[PDB]
Design a protein around this ligand. Structure first.
Ligand SMILES: Nc1nc2c(ncn2[C@@H]2O[C@H](COP(=O)(O)OP(=O)(O)NP(=O)(O)O)[C@@H](O)[C@H]2O)c(=O)[nH]1
Ligand SMILES: [Mg+2]
Lengths: 82, 166
């Protein structure tokens, strides 16, 4: 209901979503200063692979749809574990 | 390369998100968008020293309360923000100060006091009032204007120059 997106290296932004993946990604990209929700995709670092979430977190990584590999600080930000 | 953690704390609408974005993206956010939680970080050279400061932008709304502990634990410096045309935001600095030194369990944590929106004509809180408070806390006080960009660098830089001496 309240998501945390990781991007632009270390940077994180929090937002409240009501389920609509596209709308939420849009708001999220605004908080980061990135245009259009087509150029981007969400991926969550899982154990040993950058899984690409299809349909739904203290961690979500906004990464470009073209080349979806989060930066090292992006992946490093996932150190946050509870 | 040194990494300094900074946490911006204060009442709602006092200018935390605006001050932050001005130091980083260098431009005045003219709109009010309630912050939940955002973290910025930039490559900066302060006093010849090249550092990477991680800035945590806190939520001013009490509706996003809880979160306070977790982030106040892992933060080296704190800049407490009040708006000079918002008397309650001033009186609120006291309880913020306590919650800081309460979770940290220390009578001394790096902390700068900022008087923002000083570009406005409205002014319900005098500079002496702040001077006196910052004094009794044993910390520095700076008046800023996210709009005119006044003292913005002075504030953040003094906060790191503070952490080092402590
Ligand atoms: N005149 C003037 N207005 C300012 C200044 N800084 C903030 N504002 C305005 O006040 C409004 C709220 O500021 P903002 O930075 O969002 O406040 P906040 O402390 O981050 N609030 P929140 O805790 O909810 O995130 C914005 O419209 C912003 O333009 C300033 O220095 N001068
Ligand atoms: Mg804020």
């Amino acid at each position: 209901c309240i998501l945390r997106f990781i991007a632009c290296n270390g940077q994180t932004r929090a937002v409240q979503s009501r389920g609509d993946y596209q709308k939420t990604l849009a708001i999220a990209l605004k908080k980061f200063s990135l245009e259009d929700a087509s150029k981007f995709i969400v991926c969550v670092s899982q154990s040993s692979r950058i899984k690409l979430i299809t349909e739904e977190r203290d961690r979500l990584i906004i990464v470009p749809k073209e080349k979806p590999c989060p930066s090292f600080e992006d992946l490093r930000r996932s150190w946050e574990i509870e | 390369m040194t990494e300094y953690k900074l946490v911006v704390v204060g009442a709602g609408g006092v200018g935390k998100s605006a001050l932050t974005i001005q130091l980083i993206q260098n431009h005045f956010v003219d709109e009010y968008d309630p912050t939940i939680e955002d973290s910025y970080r930039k490559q900066v050279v302060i006093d010849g020293e090249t550092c990477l400061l991680d800035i945590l932008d806190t939520a001013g709304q009490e509706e996003y309360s809880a979160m306070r502990d977790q982030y106040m634990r892992t933060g080296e410096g704190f800049l407490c923000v009040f708006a000079i045309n918002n008397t309650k935001s001033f009186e609120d600095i006291h309880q913020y100060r306590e919650q800081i030194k309460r979770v940290k369990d220390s009578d001394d944590v790096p902390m700068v006091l900022v008087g923002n929106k000083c570009d406005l004509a409205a002014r319900t809180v005098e500079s002496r009032q702040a001077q006196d408070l910052a004094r009794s806390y044993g910390i520095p006080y700076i008046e800023t204007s996210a709009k005119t960009r006044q003292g913005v660098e002075d504030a953040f830089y003094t906060l790191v120059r503070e952490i080092r001496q402590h």
